[PDB]
Write a protein that binds this ligand. Structure first.
Ligand SMILES: CC(=O)N[C@@H]1[C@@H](O)[C@H](O)[C@@H](CO)O[C@H]1O
Ligand SMILES: CC(=O)N[C@@H]1[C@@H](O)[C@H](O)[C@@H](CO)O[C@H]1O
Ligand SMILES: CC(=O)N[C@@H]1[C@@H](O)[C@H](O)[C@@H](CO)O[C@H]1O
Ligand SMILES: CC(=O)N[C@@H]1[C@@H](O)[C@H](O)[C@@H](CO)O[C@H]1O
Ligand SMILES: *[C@@H]1O[C@H](CO)[C@@H](O)[C@H](O)[C@H]1NC(C)=O
Ligand SMILES: *[C@@H]1O[C@H](CO)[C@@H](O)[C@H](O)[C@H]1NC(C)=O
Ligand SMILES: *[C@@H]1O[C@H](CO)[C@@H](O)[C@H](O)[C@H]1NC(C)=O
Ligand SMILES: *[C@@H]1O[C@H](CO)[C@@H](O)[C@H](O)[C@H]1NC(C)=O
Ligand SMILES: *[C@@H]1O[C@H](CO)[C@@H](O)[C@H](O)[C@H]1NC(C)=O
Lengths: 34, 49, 126, 662, 49, 49, 49
């Protein structure tokens, strides 16, 4: 599991664009399209 | 480190370091190839958009 | 046996403290023990604290009340010990030379040696 | 020739070094190259002692002259600014007497004199200078720096540096800087002289100290002291330094510790600018980028780690009142001739009670320490327990093997383990039992190893056998108890447990006493639970382990929870808080303000994350404060969180970004 | 991945010995950082149109 | 093949326009490679190619 | 070579050779990856042309 990778140097950087922001971008694209 | 006096454990430490470094290098190469493939996929997705 | 270098030894003195020490076989290595037991006939003998090879545990009183014993030196590897208050009376010979036992441990009944040996005949008892 | 120096002895002062103390690391030539090197350097914006040597002409004022012995350490930095030269040299050595060779550096009006001799340095060294009778110029009278040498080892001469004999002008333009070190046996001396236009403190300019000379004296140096020139007290006023005075002067001193610097080399090969990587996060990111100007953005400079605070060792219950230990104390046991043998991975007897805070010599270990037992154990060992008179176990104790005391109970010749003989009224469960039992003194036939005698052998020797438990030399083999007339006997009745070495098949069998350190939760510590070892932050765990399960493991096959061997409580294992250290700062031209982001760490753990040991005024300000902010990517310090939600300028993570606003 | 931690960890002797291998760890860290940045770059290019 | 105060290497010595400080012995390029050496006997700056 | 005889130096020379070969292989792999990326970029540039 990704969440289980924390020992001996392993680190995960959170994405710059959060899932909510991606959803907002998709909604804006759909609104402009329609 | 504890089971051998440092002069004797130097060879074992060097071997372990070499093995771990080679593992890291191969992992990084695989990650680079996967990231190139994902970059191509993202370029295709942007073109589709 | 060849006498080993030391920075003060012999009979104890009233009051104050004495940094009893003796040169160790190893050089620049502190992973060794030490024993200061003196062998001599009669009951005029007192137990002396011992230092283990690990050095984490100090004296028979444990590190809870003891103090760190220095066992590393540059010019000549040596072990430093602090002496607690004891009776000045003494009759055993003192000889700071190569130790007859190297398997130092936490045992109490263990002693430096069973018989006596070459050494100074200083005595203040009889 | 003074028993003890006499003077006012006022407290010393302090001042900021700024960028002074930069020297060329090596004789290499570089043109327009930013070279980074690790060597003994004076930290930037550090504190340097400001020794005061002045005299005030008036009814009252501050008059003093300081020249005490100071430590040498890994290096020394010196500076001086006087209208007329007053500090004429320095003294280096360990004992500062004739018991060890000491470097001596002095200056005069003809040449710089450097010599190495066993000088008997005076308590208050100085140079005796007095006005000439007719010439009206300063003349030397006595060289009160030492009394005797008794040995010569080296002598060198060099051209004089800048001269300033007679005081003139109201400025200290005659600034001289010197650096001394004794690494690799070389007494390297770096110095430079430049003019200044200030009356106090140090200049704000930058000037590298070019090397001058390298003396391979090779003598160990641990102490040093500065020297100056003193005028006759009865001729001129001033503080009576042991009966002598001097004119106005002022000099500084500093110390050097290992670190790395970013040196900028001019086109001509002269150092013009230097950045101390350990000065502030801006300098650290500059060193990481190997540039003196950093563009706006976020750069990963270094990695922080929360090192363990203390070591924790835990093991099964003490154990108190364990049935296995009851056998050794007062149930189903006898003397050496009939001791009890046991082996099981159930618990440890009550001897470990004293192994928590009252670890006396009861845990008699030969060749090894009791602590080594926790880290690792011996090979197959039985559990032989019995009752004897205190330290009488010497016959059976390890070390006395090899057909010396093995007749009563034979043990392997390589027996080097631990023997437990303990007794107490409070730090124990049961009192030592009676020792009235039969014993064997000697036998003719051999004995099986790691086993006790069972043969009923009788020897018809002797004429006057001893009487009672205590007496003269005993010759009869079989008697009620026994003692060796050649060795001390008659100690207090104690019960002794001996680890009978076998060195066969099953290893890591029943062991000796094991430490039970106090449990620490929510704080990073090194833990060792029954051989299993690691580092992390112990915390209460909701996991429900089965009775036979000691510790858990994740899908990655790494420990993530351990049952407490004493309280049988599950404790989670969490790795030490570690992550990257990203410095957030706009373009160096715009501003020098920076913000430090620590990845995946609680804001409360930032100060303890290997911080608080560097320059506090510059680093600690960004390591904590009232502007600390917590975000998903990590903890942000040095920046103020706002809800304006402008467009991203610097990528931070999880939709957050940093920008520079005025 | 922290190259120094992964190969050696808390130990200091291994860290000192690994310095003999030049700047392999720096190269691997730079590559990993580049891939991480490229991930966000692709995400922004595909979505932020 | 040259050997200047123990500095051994191989190159084509030629005239050097660089200016060296009184104490500096030789020079190095950006990549930490010798590029100019001062002649100990005549103090002349000589490039290395 | 100067400070060690061939029989004993062989280990050191072999270590140097293997380390340098590893470094060169890593550099060549990185160069190949960059060449592939630039080939994709040049294909896109040709399509745009
Ligand atoms: C007694 C003393 O030396 N205090 C100084 C302090 O005034 C200064 O702020 C600090 C800066 O590093 O250095 C120290
Ligand atoms: C060449 C010569 O005359 N050297 C002397 C030197 O021996 C002496 O120690 C010093 C005293 O200040 O004066 C000068
Ligand atoms: C910044 C600097 O170093 N400039 C000097 C320049 O003044 C001098 O004319 C030239 C020739 O020596 O060398 C260079
Ligand atoms: C320090 C300590 O707890 N000592 C205990 C004591 O409290 C208890 O009454 C006794 C009976 O087993 O054993 C021992
Ligand atoms: C461990 O021993 C102590 C001392 O007798 C006892 O109080 C405690 O209950 C024991 N642990 C458990 C889990 O019973
Ligand atoms: C400062 O640097 C920034 C780049 O971060 C640039 O946009 C700006 O024009 C610079 N200003 C000056 C005065 O150089
Ligand atoms: C940081 O610690 C505080 C209190 O210890 C806690 O409330 C908070 O949730 C923690 N945050 C993170 C990200 O661990
Ligand atoms: C931002 O909002 C939080 C609560 O949503 C509030 O506590 C804080 O004061 C606000 N800050 C600003 C600068 O508006
Ligand atoms: C070098 O030595 C020679 C003679 O040995 C002499 O003629 C020449 O002037 C010297 N050059 C320097 C720079 O000292």
């Amino acid at each position: 599991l990704i969440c289980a990778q924390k020992f001996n140097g392993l680190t995960v950087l959170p994405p710059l664009l959060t899932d909510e922001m991606i959803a907002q971008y998709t909604s804006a694209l759909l609104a402009g399209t329609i | 480190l504890s089971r051998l006096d440092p002069p004797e454990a130097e060879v074992q430490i060097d071997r372990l370091i070499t093995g771990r470094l080679q593992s890291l290098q191969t992992y990084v190469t695989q990650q680079l190839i996967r990231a190139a493939e994902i970059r191509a996929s993202a370029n295709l997705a942007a073109t589709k958009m | 046996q060849v006498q080993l270098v030391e920075s003060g030894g012999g009979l104890v003195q009233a009051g104050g403290s004495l940094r009893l020490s003796c040169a160790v076989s190893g050089r620049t290595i502190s992973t060794f023990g030490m024993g200061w037991f003196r062998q001599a006939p009669g009951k005029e003998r007192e137990f002396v604290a011992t230092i283990t090879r690990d050095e984490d545990m100090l004296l028979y009183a444990d590190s809870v009340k003891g103090r760190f014993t220095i066992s590393r030196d540059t010019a000549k590897n040596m072990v430093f010990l602090q002496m607690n208050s004891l009776k000045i009376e003494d009759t055993a010979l003192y000889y700071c030379a190569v130790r007859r036992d190297s398997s130092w441990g936490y045992s109490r009944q263990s002693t430096e040696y069973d018989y006596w040996g070459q050494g100074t005949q200083v005595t203040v008892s009889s | 020739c003074v028993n003890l120096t006499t003077r006012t002895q006022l407290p010393p002062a302090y001042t900021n070094s700024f960028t002074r103390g930069v020297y060329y690391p090596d004789k290499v030539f570089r043109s327009s190259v930013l070279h980074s090197t690790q060597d003994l350097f004076l930290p930037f914006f550090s504190n340097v002692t400001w020794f005061h040597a002045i005299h005030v002409s008036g009814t009252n004022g501050t008059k003093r002259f300081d020249n005490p012995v100071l430590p040498f350490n890994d290096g020394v930095y010196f500076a001086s600014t006087e209208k007329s030269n007053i500090i004429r040299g320095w003294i280096f050595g360990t004992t500062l007497d004739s018991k060890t060779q000491s470097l001596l550096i002095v200056n005069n009006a003809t040449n710089v004199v450097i010599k190495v001799c066993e000088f008997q340095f005076c308590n208050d060294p100085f140079l005796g200078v007095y006005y000439h009778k007719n010439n009206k110029s300063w003349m030397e009278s006595e060289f009160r720096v030492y009394s005797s040498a008794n040995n010569c080892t080296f002598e060198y001469v060099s051209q004089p540096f800048l001269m300033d004999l007679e005081g003139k002008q109201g400025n200290f333009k005659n600034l001289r800087e010197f650096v001394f070190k004794n690494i690799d046996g070389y007494f390297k001396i770096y110095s430079k002289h430049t003019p200044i236009n200030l009356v106090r403190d140090l200049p704000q300019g930058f000037s590298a100290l070019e090397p001058l000379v390298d003396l391979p004296i090779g003598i160990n140096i641990t102490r040093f002291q500065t020297l100056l020139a003193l005028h006759r007290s009865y001729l001129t006023p001033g503080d009576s330094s042991s009966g002598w005075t001097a004119g106005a002067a002022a000099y500084y001193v500093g110390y050097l510790q290992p670190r790395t610097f970013l040196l900028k080399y001019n086109e001509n090969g002269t150092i013009t600018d230097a950045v101390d990587c350990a000065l502030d996060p801006l300098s650290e990111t500059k060193c990481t980028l190997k540039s003196f100007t950093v563009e706006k953005g976020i750069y990963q400079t270094s990695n922080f780690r929360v090192q363990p605070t203390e070591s924790i060792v835990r093991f099964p219950n003490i154990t108190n009142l364990c049935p296995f230990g009851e056998v050794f104390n007062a149930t189903r046991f006898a003397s050496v001739y009939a001791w009890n043998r046991k082996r099981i991975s159930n618990c440890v007897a009550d001897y470990s009670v004293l192994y928590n805070s009252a670890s006396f010599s009861t845990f008699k270990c030969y060749g090894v320490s009791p602590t080594k037992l926790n880290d690792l154990c011996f090979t197959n060992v039985y559990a032989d327990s019995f009752v004897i008179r205190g330290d009488e176990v010497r016959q059976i104790a390890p070390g006395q093997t090899g057909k010396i005391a093995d007749y009563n109970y034979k043990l392997p010749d390589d027996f080097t383990g631990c023997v437990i003989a303990w007794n107490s009224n409070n730090l124990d469960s049961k009192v030592g039992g009676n020792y009235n039992y039969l014993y064997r003194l000697f036998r003719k036939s051999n004995l099986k190893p790691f086993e006790r005698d069972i043969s009923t052998e009788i020897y018809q020797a002797g004429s006057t056998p001893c009487n009672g438990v205590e007496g003269f030399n005993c010759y009869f083999p079989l008697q009620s108890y026994g003692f060796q007339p050649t060795n001390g006997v008659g100690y207090q009745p104690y019960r002794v447990v001996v680890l009978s070495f076998e060195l066969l098949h099953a290893p890591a069998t029943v062991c000796g006493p094991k430490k039970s350190t106090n449990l620490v939760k929510n704080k990073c510590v090194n833990f060792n639970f029954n051989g299993l070892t690691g580092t992390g932050v112990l915390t209460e765990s909701n996991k429900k382990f089965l009775p036979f399960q000691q510790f858990g493991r994740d899908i990655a096959d790494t420990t993530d929870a351990v049952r407490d061997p004493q309280t049988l409580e599950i404790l989670d294992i969490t790795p030490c808080s570690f992550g990257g250290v990203s410095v957030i700062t706009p373009g160096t031209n715009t501003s020098n303000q920076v913000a430090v982001l620590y990845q995946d760490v609680n804001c409360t753990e930032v100060p303890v994350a290997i911080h608080a040991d560097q320059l506090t005024p510059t680093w600690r300000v960004y390591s904590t404060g009232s502007n600390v902010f917590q975000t998903r990517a990590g903890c942000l310090i040095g920046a103020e969180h706002v809800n304006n939600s402008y467009e991203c300028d610097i990528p931070i993570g999880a939709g957050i970004c940093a920008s520079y606003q005025t | 991945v922290d190259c120094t931690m992964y190969i050696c960890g808390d130990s200091t002797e291994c860290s000192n010995l690994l310095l003999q291998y030049g700047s392999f760890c720096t190269q691997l860290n730079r590559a990993l950082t580049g891939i991480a940045v490229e991930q966000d770059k692709n995400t922004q290019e595909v979505f932020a149109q």
